[PDB]
Short mmCIF file of C-alpha atoms and ligand atoms in Angstrom, two decimals:
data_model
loop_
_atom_site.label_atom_id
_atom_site.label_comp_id
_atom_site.label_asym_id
_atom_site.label_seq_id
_atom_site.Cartn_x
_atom_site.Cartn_y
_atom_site.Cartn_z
CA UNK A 1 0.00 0.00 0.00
CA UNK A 2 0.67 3.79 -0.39
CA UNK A 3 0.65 6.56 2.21
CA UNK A 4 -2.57 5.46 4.35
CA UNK A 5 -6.02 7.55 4.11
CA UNK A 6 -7.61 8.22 6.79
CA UNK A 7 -9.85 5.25 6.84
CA UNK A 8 -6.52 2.91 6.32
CA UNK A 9 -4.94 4.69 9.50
CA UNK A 10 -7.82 3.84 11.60
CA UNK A 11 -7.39 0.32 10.73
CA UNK A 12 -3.79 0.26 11.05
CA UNK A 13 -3.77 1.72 14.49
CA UNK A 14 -6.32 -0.19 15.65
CA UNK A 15 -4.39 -3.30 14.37
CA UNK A 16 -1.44 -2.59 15.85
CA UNK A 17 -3.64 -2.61 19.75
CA UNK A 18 -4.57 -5.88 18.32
CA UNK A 19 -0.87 -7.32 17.95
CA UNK A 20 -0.13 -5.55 21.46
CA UNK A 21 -3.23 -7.36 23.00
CA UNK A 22 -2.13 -10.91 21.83
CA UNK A 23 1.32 -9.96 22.23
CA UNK A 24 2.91 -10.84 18.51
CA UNK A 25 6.30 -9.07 18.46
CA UNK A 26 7.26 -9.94 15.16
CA UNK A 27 3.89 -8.64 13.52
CA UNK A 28 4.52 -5.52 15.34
CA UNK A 29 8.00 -5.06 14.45
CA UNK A 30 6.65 -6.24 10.40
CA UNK A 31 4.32 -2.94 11.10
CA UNK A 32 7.11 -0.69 11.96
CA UNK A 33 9.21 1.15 9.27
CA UNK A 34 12.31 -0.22 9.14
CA UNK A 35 14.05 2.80 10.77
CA UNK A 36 11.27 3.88 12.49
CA UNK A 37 11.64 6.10 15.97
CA UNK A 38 9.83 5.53 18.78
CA UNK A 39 9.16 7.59 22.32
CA UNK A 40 7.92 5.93 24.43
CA UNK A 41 6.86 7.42 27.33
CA UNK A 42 6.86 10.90 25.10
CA UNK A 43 10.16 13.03 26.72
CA UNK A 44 12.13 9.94 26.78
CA UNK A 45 15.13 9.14 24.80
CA UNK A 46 13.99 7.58 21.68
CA UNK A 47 14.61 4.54 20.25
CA UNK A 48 15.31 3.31 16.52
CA UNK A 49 15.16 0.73 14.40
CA UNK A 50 13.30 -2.39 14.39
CA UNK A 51 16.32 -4.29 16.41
CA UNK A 52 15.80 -1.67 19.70
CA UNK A 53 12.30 -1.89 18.73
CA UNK A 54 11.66 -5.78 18.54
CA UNK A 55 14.00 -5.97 22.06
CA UNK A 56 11.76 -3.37 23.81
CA UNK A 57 8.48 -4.94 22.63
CA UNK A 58 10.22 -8.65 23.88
CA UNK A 59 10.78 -7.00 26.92
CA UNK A 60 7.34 -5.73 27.50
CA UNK A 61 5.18 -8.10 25.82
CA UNK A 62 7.15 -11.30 25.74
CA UNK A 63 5.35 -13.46 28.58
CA UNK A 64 2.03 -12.53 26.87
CA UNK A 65 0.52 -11.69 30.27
CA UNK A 66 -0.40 -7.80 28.79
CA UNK A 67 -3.63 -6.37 27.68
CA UNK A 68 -4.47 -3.71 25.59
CA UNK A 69 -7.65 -2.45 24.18
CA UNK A 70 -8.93 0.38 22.36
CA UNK A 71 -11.01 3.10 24.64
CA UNK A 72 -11.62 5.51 21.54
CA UNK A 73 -11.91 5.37 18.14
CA UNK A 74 -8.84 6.13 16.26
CA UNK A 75 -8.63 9.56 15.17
CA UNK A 76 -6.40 9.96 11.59
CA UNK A 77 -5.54 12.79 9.24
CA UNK A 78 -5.01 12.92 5.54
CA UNK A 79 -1.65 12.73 5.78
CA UNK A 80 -1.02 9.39 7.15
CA UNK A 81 -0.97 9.91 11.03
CA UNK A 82 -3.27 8.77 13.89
CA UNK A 83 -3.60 9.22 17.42
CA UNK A 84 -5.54 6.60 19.68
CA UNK A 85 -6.36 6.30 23.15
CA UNK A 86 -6.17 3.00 24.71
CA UNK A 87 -5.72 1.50 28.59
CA UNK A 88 -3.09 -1.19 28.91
CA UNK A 89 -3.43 -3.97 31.40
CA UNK A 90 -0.91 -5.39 33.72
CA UNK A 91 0.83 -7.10 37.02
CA UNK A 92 2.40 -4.30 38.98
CA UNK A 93 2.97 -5.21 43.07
CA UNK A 94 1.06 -8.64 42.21
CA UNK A 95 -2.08 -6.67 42.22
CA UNK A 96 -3.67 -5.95 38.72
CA UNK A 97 -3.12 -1.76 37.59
CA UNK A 98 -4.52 -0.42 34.50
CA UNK A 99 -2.56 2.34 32.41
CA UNK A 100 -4.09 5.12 30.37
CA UNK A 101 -1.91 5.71 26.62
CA UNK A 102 -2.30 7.47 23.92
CA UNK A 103 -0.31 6.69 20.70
CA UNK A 104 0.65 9.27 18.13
CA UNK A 105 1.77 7.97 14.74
CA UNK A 106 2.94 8.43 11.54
CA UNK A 107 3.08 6.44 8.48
CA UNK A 108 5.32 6.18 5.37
CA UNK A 109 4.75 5.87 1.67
CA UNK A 110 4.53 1.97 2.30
CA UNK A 111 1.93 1.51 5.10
CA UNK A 112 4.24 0.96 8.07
CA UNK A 113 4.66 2.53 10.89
CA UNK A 114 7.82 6.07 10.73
CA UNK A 115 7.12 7.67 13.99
CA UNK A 116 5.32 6.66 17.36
CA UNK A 117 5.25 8.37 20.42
CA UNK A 118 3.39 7.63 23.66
CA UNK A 119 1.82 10.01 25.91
CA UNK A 120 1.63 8.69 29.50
CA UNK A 121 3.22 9.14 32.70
CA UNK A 122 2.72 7.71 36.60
CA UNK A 123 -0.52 9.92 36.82
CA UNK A 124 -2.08 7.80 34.30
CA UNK A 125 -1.25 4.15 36.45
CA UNK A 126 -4.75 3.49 38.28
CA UNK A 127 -3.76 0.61 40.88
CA UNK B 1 4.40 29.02 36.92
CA UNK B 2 7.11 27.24 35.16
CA UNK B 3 7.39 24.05 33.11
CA UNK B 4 4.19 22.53 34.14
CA UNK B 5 4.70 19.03 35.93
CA UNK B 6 2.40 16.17 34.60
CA UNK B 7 -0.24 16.29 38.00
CA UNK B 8 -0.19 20.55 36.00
CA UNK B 9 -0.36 19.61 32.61
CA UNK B 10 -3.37 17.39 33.04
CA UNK B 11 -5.20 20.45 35.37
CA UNK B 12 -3.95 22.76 32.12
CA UNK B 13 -5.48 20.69 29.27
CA UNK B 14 -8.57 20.43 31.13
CA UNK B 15 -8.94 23.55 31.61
CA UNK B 16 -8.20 24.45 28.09
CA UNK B 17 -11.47 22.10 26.92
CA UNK B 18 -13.83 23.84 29.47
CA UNK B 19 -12.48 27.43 28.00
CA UNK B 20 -13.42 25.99 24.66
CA UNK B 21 -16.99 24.38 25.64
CA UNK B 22 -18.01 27.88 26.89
CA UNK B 23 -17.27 29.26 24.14
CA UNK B 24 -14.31 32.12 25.68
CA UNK B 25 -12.09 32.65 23.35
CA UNK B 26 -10.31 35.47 25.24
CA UNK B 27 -9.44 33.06 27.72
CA UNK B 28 -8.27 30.48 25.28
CA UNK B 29 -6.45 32.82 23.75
CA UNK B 30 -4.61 33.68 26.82
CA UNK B 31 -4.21 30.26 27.12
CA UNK B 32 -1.84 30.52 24.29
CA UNK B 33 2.41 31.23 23.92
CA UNK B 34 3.00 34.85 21.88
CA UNK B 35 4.48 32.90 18.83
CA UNK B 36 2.26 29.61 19.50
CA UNK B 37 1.83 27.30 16.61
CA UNK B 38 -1.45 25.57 15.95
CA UNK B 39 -2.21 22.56 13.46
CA UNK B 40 -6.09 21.81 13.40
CA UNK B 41 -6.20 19.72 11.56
CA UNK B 42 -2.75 17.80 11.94
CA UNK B 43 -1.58 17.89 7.92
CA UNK B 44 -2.80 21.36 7.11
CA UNK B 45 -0.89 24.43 7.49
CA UNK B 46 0.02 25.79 10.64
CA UNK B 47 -0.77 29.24 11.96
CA UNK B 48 1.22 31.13 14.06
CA UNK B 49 0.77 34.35 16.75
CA UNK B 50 -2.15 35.28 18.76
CA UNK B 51 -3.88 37.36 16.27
CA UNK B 52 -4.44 34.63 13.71
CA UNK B 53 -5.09 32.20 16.81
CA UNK B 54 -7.73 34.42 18.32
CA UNK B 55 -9.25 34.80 14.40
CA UNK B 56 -9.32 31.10 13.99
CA UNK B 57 -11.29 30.34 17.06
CA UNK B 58 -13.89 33.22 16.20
CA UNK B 59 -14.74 31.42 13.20
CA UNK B 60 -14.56 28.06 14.95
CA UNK B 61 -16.70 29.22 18.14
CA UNK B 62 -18.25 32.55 17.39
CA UNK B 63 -21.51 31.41 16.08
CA UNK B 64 -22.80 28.04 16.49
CA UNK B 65 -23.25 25.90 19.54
CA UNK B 66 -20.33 24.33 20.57
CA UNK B 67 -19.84 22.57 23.07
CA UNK B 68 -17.01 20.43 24.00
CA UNK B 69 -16.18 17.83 26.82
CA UNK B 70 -13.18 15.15 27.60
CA UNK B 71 -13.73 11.78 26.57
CA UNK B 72 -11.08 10.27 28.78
CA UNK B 73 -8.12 11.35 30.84
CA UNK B 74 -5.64 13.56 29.98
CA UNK B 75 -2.42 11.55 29.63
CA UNK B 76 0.73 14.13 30.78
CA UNK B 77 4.29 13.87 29.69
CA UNK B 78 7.26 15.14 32.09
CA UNK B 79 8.37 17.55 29.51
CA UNK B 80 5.71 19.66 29.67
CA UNK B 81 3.66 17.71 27.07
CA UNK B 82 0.48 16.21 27.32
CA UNK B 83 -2.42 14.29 25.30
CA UNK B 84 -6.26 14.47 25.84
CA UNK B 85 -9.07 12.81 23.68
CA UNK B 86 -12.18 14.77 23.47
CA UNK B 87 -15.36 15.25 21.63
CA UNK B 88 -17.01 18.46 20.09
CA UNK B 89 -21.16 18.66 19.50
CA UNK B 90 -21.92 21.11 16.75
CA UNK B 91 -24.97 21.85 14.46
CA UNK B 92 -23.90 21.79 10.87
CA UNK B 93 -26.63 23.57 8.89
CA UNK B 94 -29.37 21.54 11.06
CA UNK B 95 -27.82 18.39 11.45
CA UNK B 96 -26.40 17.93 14.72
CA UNK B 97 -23.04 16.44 14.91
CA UNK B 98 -20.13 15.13 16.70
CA UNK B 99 -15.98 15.21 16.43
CA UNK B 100 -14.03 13.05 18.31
CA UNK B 101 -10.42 14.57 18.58
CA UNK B 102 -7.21 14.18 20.28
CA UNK B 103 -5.14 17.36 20.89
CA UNK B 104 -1.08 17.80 21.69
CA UNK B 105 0.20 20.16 23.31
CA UNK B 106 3.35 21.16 24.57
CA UNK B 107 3.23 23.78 27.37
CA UNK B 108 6.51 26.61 27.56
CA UNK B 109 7.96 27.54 31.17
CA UNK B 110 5.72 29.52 31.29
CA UNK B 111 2.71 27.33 31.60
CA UNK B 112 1.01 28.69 28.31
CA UNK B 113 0.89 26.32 24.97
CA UNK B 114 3.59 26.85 22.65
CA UNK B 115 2.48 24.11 20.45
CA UNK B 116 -0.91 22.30 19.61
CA UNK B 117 -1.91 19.57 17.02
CA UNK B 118 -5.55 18.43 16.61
CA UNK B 119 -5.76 14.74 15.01
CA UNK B 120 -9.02 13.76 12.99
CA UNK B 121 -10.78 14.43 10.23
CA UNK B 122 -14.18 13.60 8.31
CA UNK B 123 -14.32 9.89 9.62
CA UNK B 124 -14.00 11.09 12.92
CA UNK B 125 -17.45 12.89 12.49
CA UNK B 126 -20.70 11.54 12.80
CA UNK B 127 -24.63 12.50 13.11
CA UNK B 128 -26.00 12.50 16.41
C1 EQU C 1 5.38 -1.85 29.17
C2 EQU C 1 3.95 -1.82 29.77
C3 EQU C 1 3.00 -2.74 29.02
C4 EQU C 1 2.73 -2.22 27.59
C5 EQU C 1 2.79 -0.70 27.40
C6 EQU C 1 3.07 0.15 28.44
C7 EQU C 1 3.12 1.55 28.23
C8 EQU C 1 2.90 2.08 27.00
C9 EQU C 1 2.62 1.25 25.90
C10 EQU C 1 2.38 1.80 24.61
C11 EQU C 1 2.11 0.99 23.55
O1 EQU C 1 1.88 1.46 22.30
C12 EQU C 1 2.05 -0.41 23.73
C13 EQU C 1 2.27 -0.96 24.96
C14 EQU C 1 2.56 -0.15 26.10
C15 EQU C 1 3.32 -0.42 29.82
C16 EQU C 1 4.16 0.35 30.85
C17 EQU C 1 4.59 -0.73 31.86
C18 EQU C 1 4.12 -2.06 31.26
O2 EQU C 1 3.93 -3.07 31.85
C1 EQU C 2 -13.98 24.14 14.32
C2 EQU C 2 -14.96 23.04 14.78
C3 EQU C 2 -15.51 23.33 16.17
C4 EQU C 2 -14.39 23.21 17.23
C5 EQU C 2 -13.23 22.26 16.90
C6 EQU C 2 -13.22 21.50 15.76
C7 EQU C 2 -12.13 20.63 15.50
C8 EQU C 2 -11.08 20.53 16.36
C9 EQU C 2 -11.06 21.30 17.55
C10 EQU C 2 -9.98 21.21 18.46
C11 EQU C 2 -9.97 21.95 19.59
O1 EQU C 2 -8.97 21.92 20.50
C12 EQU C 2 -11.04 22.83 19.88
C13 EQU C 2 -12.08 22.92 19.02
C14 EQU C 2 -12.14 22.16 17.82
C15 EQU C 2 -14.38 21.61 14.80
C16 EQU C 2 -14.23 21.24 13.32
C17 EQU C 2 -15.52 21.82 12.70
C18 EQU C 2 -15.98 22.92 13.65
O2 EQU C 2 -16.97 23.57 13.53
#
């Protein structure tokens, strides 16, 4: 595919919560740009390429125990970027917490994924 | 204030929706840096200074209904950045309709927003 519409972002996105939900690292790094850069929270240092990015994801989703799900609909321009709010599930202390994201991305020319970054901090961790 | 913490940013992008939903745009203005850059929609030109900010909300607010309210919680950076996902009711020419948007903004030191980018766009809207 080309640069995604608008329609083709909200699918994207929403596919990509999807692959985070079930934990699939290597479908999520196969959505990711090649070179793509990633923030994640937003103000920290980035990361780049799909090698950082397939360790971090490994890292995070690896034992499969995450949940994520969708808690708006994706909102996307006409110039192949989205932003999506979601709440991810977790173990933190042994007791279940819930965490409140939003995604910002953009897409290339080919469909995958250039730039994320993720909006979230320790005010956003409910339990 | 200075550099607003994330516990501030959240209390600032609320506020910022609440200024918009009744309809102020003096206050949102204020709201605003001097040489504050606005993209609404993300992927269209952006505008910069108060003057043009102020004249975009007039034709934005100054006229019909709006009304705007948070769909969810703000999510705050600790750079002074922040996210929020929102929804504005209009009436478009009869029809009564909804937006559902997500702003970003990045606040300066001195707690007014330097930058803001408003994702959606014609799928986002619908007929209430
Ligand atoms: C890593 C993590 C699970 C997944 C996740 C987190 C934060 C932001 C995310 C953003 C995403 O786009 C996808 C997944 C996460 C959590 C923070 C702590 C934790 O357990
Ligand atoms: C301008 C507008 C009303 C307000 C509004 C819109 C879109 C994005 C916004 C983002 C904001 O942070 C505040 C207000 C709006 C609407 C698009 C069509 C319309 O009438």
């Amino acid at each position: 595919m080309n640069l995604p519409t608008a329609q083709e972002v909200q699918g994207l996105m929403a596919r990509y919560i999807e692959l985070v939900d079930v934990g699939d690292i290597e479908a999520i790094v196969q959505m990711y740009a090649d070179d793509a850069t990633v923030e994640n929270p937003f103000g920290q240092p980035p990361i780049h390429g799909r090698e950082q990015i397939a360790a971090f994801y490994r890292q995070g989703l690896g034992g499969g125990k995450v949940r994520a799900c969708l808690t708006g609909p994706v909102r996307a321009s006409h110039n192949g970027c989205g932003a999506m709010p979601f709440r991810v599930e977790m173990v933190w202390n042994g007791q279940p917490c819930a965490l409140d994201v939003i995604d910002v991305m953009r897409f290339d020319e080919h469909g995958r994924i250039q730039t994320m970054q993720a909006y979230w901090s320790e005010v956003n961790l409910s339990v």
